[PDB]
Amino acid sequence: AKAKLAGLDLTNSVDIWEKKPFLEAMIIVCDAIMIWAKRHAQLARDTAAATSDPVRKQELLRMADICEHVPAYPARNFREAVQCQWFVQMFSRIEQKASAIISNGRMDQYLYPYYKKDIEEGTLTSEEAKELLECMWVDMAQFIDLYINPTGNEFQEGYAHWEAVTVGGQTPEGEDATNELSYLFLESKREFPMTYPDLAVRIHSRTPDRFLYEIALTVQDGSGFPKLINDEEVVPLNAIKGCPINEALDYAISGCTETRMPNRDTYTSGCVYINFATALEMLMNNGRLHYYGDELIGLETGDPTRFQTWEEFYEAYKAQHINLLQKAFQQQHIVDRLRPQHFAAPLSSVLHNLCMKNMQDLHSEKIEGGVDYSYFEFLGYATVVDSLAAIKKLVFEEKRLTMREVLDAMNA
Amino acid sequence: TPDRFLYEIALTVQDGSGFPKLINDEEVVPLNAIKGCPINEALDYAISGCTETRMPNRDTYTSGCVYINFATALEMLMNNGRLHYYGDELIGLETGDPTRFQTWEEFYEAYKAQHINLLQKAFQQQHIVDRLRPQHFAAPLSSVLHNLCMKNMQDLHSEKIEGGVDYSYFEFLGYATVVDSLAAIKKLVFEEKRLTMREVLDAMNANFVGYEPIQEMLKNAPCYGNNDPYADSIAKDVDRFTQVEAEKSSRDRGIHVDVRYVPITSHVPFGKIIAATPNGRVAGFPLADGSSASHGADHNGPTAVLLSNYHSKNYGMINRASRLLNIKLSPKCVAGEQGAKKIMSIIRTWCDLKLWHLQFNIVNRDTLLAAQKDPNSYRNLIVRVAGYSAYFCDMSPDLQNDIIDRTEHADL
Amino acid sequence: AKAKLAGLDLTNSVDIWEKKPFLEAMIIVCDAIMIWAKRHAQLARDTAAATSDPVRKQELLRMADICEHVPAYPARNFREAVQCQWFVQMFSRIEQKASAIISNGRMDQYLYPYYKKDIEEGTLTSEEAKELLECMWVDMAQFIDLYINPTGNEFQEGYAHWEAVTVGGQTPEGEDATNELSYLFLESKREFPMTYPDLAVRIHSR
Ligand code: NA
Ligand code: NA
């Protein structure tokens, strides 16, 4: 950032305003996380001084040396690499409330070089590596998502959370990426059953049988891990939509089922959730929902018993359905316009190639070179489908019931 | 692909006439879509010519593309930019006396210089072709049948037609010849030092006459098509740095410039001008064609050939098109029900590996030589040669021996 | 042109075709006009040797020195500047048939630095400058616009020609550009009445 700043032309009319403030922000946020970490080193030294148990006292002193080095300097081993990861994901929580709580990336890939070097040099064992990872999970288990907005609380009932940890998949070169760490994460999830972390596994058409077996064993364990995401669906969609194929192959699972390319993704707006069951009811009730009485919420599609053919009834459904879609898209566009006025993410930006190249915060609307993957949520899919199919067969096809009959049964 | 249909395919392969050829949607469709073709049109592709994939209302590029004899890069490295066939004419780069190279690294870099020099001239030649063809060629019938020609009111052989996708090519001939020759020198001259550069040169200059032990030793060095990384990693890097150049040409020309390994019968004349090579091939003999194993070099069964193909590719790039891949099976190995299931299984593996093309040849070596002696008794012998179906008995000796000298895999 | 050519990337897919042939053409056309001028230098020497009159012999010999230097090298004085101009306008006729026959530009502006210097240093007088310009007119008067196509003949009947010579006007900085040469051109037109050159004056509010 300092070198980019030195490279600006601060005699011209524009750089001092368009570019220099962003780079000042980046310089400051680097200082912020490095200050925060150095404060943990002194605290470890002080807690050691006050600790008699001499094994713990030496643990804390190793911790102090660790925190003096990372994340200001490159990690030198697996222990430093994990504490660096930890500082970044915890300062991310300080930065902002990324949906589902900040996700953790392809840990089996980026920690493996540290892990393999340490094992081979005998400074680390697989049991010690599992311990450190499991320490991560127990402290992540103490950070609970506090939703104050009732809508958030009811959309994430029970402290819902998905700090995805990604293992397996392919390399940026398109070969299988399984390594000893990938197996270690799965062993650990069977041996240390708990709701943390959200272990998520990438599958592709050449996932090796031995690894897929290890996955099946984990599934058999019955703890609901790992979740599975399909490269063969994800990678071509994301690449077709503009992500370079090597970065698309290098994706991380994020939140519940999402796919992030950490130096290509640029869209960050929480997206609309559509209750499409309301379109069904409003079709049955002239644009009203019984929960709201006479309030016209949707379209006045008429007395439902007036529909003579399934085609006329399905077109009316589509009218209700598309009316919600149009308002959802309008709602989301406004959200996209307002969020940059309220939200920034300097730490996420300084770690983003495109934010640094363009000298823009990640929550800017348009970042040249980025790909913007946005969403709208379809809720009630099977409910709408089965309802429509029931009316299709019984009312219009087999004429075994009237619309009137069905209405009164539902009304009751 | 449904099992019932794949079985019908296997039964056709068993019939022994060399049909059908196979093209793999799982490689073709995402590449063409990533490159710009709308997914629905890409899924609707037609096979065209030998292995190519056309979208009849989206494709717009029609220029016959350059064919590169990369065995010349190898020989010119062994001969200070000369080819023996042309005497003292300086054709490529003056990379010097090959006995001077101290390290593999130096030798390989000089190979790259020769290889890249040929690419640079091939790309230039093609761009001139692209500029000249519209002045000589039109296709009014093809245009009237083409949505984009009709929308833009431009003939198909126009250079740029808005909305089109331009898939262009350059041909890599002699892939396995180059890879095996480089592997043989790396192993035997530079790593094990079992041979000096001078000795390999003298043997080659003699067409191995009187040097049969050196020839045997070169031939037993690691070869492409055995899933041996010693050689396949060379094949992968060669394909990779070729695509690096192709990405640059694509940017400068505004079209997709993709490496392709579709030989037609070009490996015969290309082989005629190439002296003996360090893999043990004698002077004037056909080059390795497509991405198949060099003649008789594959001794680990057909799956190994597929895996060498997979591991020599660069799936985190996109500047690739077809690879022509032929494997010859002994008819005993594929006879009856069990044999058809084995054909089915090879096809499923090839699909999962995202290989572009596959062609089976099911013929016994005795049948082939018997048909050379007594043609009248084998006039019904249909085989696959250079990619096309032919009556073996109508083929020239050059091509008969091309097919005969391929490995006949027996253990399927 | 050679420098632009050396600055191309002749390893890339396109420059060797899109740009190099143009720069090769420019290199060649520069040789063309230089070769043509040099053959004049030698013609002048040979003519001088065959000429008994001592005065004309010296004239032809100075001509040969002039044609050896210009247009290959920068003009060093008014006489070289005018003969340079003459080579460019005559070689332009060889190049093509520009309508009206090639025009001559702001002669009073680009010749003035040469004219002022030679005047001041005593190598040239205004009468000699006027004689040299008038030599231009009488040889321009022998180059007749030949229209074969009847349409051109009837749209320019009578050997119509407009080889414009511009005097006066404004400088690139928007001040009046009148100088001693501007007046010299108008004097010469009065003193030496003739249908060449097509003398055209720029007028402005000042
Ligand atoms: Na953004
Ligand atoms: Na075209």
- Tokens read off for A43: 């605290």
Please provide the size of chain C in residues.
206
Nearest residue to B64 (alpha-carbon basis) of B266, B210, B208: B266
The helix or strand, by DSSP H or E, that contains position B357, with its residue range, turns out to be strand B357-362
Nearest residue to A49 (alpha-carbon basis) of A35, A37, A34, A60: A60
Nearest residue to B174 (alpha-carbon basis) of B76, B50, B33, B44: B76
- B44/chain C closest Cα distance in angstroms: 33
Distance CA B311, CA A357 (A): 34
Question: Partners of B259 in the beta sheet?
Answer: B170, B320
- Tokens read off for A195: 């709701």
Question: Partners of B173 in the beta sheet?
Answer: B69
Kindly give, in sequence order, each residue whose CB lies less than 8 Å from that of residue A200, ignoring residues fewer than 6 positions away.
A164, A165, A166, A167, A226, A227, A228, A229, A253
Residues in chain C followed by a break, C to N above 2.5 angstroms: none
Residue B53 near residue B34 (C-beta atoms within 8 A): no
Q: Say whether A174 and B26 touch across the interface (CB within 8 A).
A: no
User: What is Dmax (Cα atoms) for chain C?
Assistant: 63
CA distances from B227 to B45, B230, B306, B406, C19 (A): 31, 9, 8, 17, 47
Q: Between the CA atoms of A238, A243, A247 and A253, what dihedral angle is there, to the nearest 10 degrees?
A: -40
Distance CA A76, CA A92 (A): 23
> Token pair 């650990």 is at which residue?
A188
Nearest residue to B179 (alpha-carbon basis) of B318, B312, B22: B312
Residue C64 near residue C44 (C-beta atoms within 8 A): yes
**End-to-end CA gap in chain B:** 22
- Tokens read off for B217: 């030793």
CA distances from B166 to A3, B58, B290, C13 (A): 41, 9, 22, 16
Q: How many CB atoms lie within 10 A of CB B365?
A: 14
DSSP, residue by residue, A365-383 = S--TT-B-----EEE-HHH
- B246/chain C closest Cα distance in angstroms: 10
Please give the annotated binding residues of B for (2S)-3-sulfopropanediol, written as ranges.
Answer: 50, 52, 260
Question: Partners of A199 in the beta sheet?
Answer: A165
Kindly give, in sequence order, each residue whose CB lies less than 8 Å from that of residue A389, ignoring residues fewer than 6 positions away.
none
Q: Say whether A240 and B34 touch across the interface (CB within 8 A).
A: yes
Q: What angle do CA B83, B231, B301 make, to 5 degrees?
A: 115
Q: Could you tell me the distance, in angstroms and rounded to a whole number, from the CA of residue A96 to the centre of ligand 1?
A: 14
Q: Is the preceding omega at residue A197 within 30 degrees of 0, hence cis? A: yes
Cβ of C14 under 8 Å from any chain B Cβ?
A: yes
Question: Partners of B261 in the beta sheet?
Answer: B323
Kindly give, in sequence order, each residue whose CB lies less than 8 Å from that of residue B8, ignoring residues fewer than 6 positions away.
none
Which residue blocks in C7-125 are alpha helix, DSSP H? Answer: 15-18, 20-49, 54-69, 78-95, 107-110, 112-121
- Tokens read off for B244: 């690096």
Residue type, A89: Q
Please provide the size of chain A in residues.
412
Kindly give, in sequence order, each residue whose CB lies less than 8 Å from that of residue A244, ignoring residues fewer than 6 positions away.
A264
If you ran DSSP here, which 8-state letter would residue B283 be given? Answer: T
How far out from the chain centre does Cα A304 lie?
A: 42
Distance CA B174, CA B288 (A): 5
Helix/strand/coil for A394 = helix
Distance CA B235, CA B242 (A): 11
Nearest residue to C94 (alpha-carbon basis) of C52, C143, C28: C143
- Tokens read off for B198: 């001078």
Distance CA B352, CA B291 (A): 18
Helix/strand/coil for A90 = helix
Distance CA B218, CA B199 (A): 11
Kindly give, in sequence order, each residue whose CB lies less than 8 Å from that of residue A134, ignoring residues fewer than 6 positions away.
A188, A192
Residue type, B117: N
Distance CA B272, CA B288 (A): 12
Cβ of A340 under 8 Å from any chain B Cβ?
A: no
CA dihedral sign, ordered A170, A216, B347, B332: positive
Q: Could you tell me the distance, in angstroms and rounded to a whole number, from the CA of residue A104 to the centre of ligand 1?
A: 20
CA dihedral sign, ordered C173, C178, C184, C187: positive
**End-to-end CA gap in chain C:** 41
CA dihedral sign, ordered B351, B356, B360, B365: negative
Chains C and A touch, using 3 or more CB pairs below 8 Å: no
Residue A348 near residue A95 (C-beta atoms within 8 A): yes
Q: What angle do CA C126, C131, C137 make, to 5 degrees?
A: 130
In our burial notation (b when 16+ CB lie closer than 10 A, e otherwise), range A196-230 reads: bbbbbbbbbebbeeebeebbeebeeeeeebbeebe
Q: How many CB atoms lie within 10 A of CB B107?
A: 21
Distance CA B288, CA B231 (A): 15
Nearest residue to A262 (alpha-carbon basis) of A109, A33, A113, A69: A109
Distance CA B89, CA B257 (A): 30
If you ran DSSP here, which 8-state letter would residue A308 be given? Answer: -
Q: Alpha-carbon Rg of chain C, whole angstroms?
A: 20
Establish, for the pair of chains A and B, how many residue pairs have beta carbons separated by less than 8 Å.
37
Contacts of B314 in chain A (CB under 8 A): 173-174
Q: Which long-range contacts (CB under 8 A, 24 or more apart) does A400-404 make?
A: A402/A305, A403/A304, A403/A305, A403/A307, A404/A305
Contacts of C13 in chain B (CB under 8 A): 120, 123-124, 126-127, 248-249, 252-253, 257
Distance CA C77, CA C124 (A): 9
CA distances from A11 to A8, A18, A23 (A): 9, 13, 17
- Tokens read off for B158: 């126009």
- B13/chain A closest Cα distance in angstroms: 25
Q: What is the resolution of this structure in A?
A: 2.2
DSSP, residue by residue, B150-217 = HHHT--TTSS--TT-B-EEEEEEE-HHHHHHHHHHHIIIIIIS-SS-HHHHHHHHHTTTTT-HHHHHH
CA distances from B364 to A362, B333, B390, B403, C10 (A): 64, 10, 16, 11, 52
Q: How many CB atoms lie within 10 A of CB A264?
A: 22
Nearest residue to B35 (alpha-carbon basis) of A274, A244, A224, A172: A244
Kindly give, in sequence order, each residue whose CB lies less than 8 Å from that of residue B211, ignoring residues fewer than 6 positions away.
B202, B203
* Chain A touching partners, 3 or more CB pairs below 8 A: B
Residue A268 near residue A92 (C-beta atoms within 8 A): no
Kindly give, in sequence order, each residue whose CB lies less than 8 Å from that of residue A280, ignoring residues fewer than 6 positions away.
A317, A320, A380, A383, A384, A387, A388
Q: Say whether A173 and B315 touch across the interface (CB within 8 A).
A: yes
Distance CA B51, CA B359 (A): 10
Residues with CB under 5 A from ligand 1 (ion): A 266
CA distances from C41 to C64, C65, C66, C70, C135 (A): 4, 7, 8, 10, 18
Q: Say whether C13 and B131 touch across the interface (CB within 8 A).
A: no
Residue type, A117: K
If you ran DSSP here, which 8-state letter would residue C157 be given? Answer: T
Distance CA B138, CA A329 (A): 46
DSSP, residue by residue, A328-375 = HHHHHHHHHHHGGGT---HHHHHT-HHHHHHT--TTSS--TT-B----
The helix or strand, by DSSP H or E, that contains position A126, with its residue range, turns out to be helix A126-140
Nearest residue to C83 (alpha-carbon basis) of C65, C105, C95, C106: C65
Distance CA C29, CA A215 (A): 75
- Tokens read off for A38: 């150095």
- A261/chain B closest Cα distance in angstroms: 14
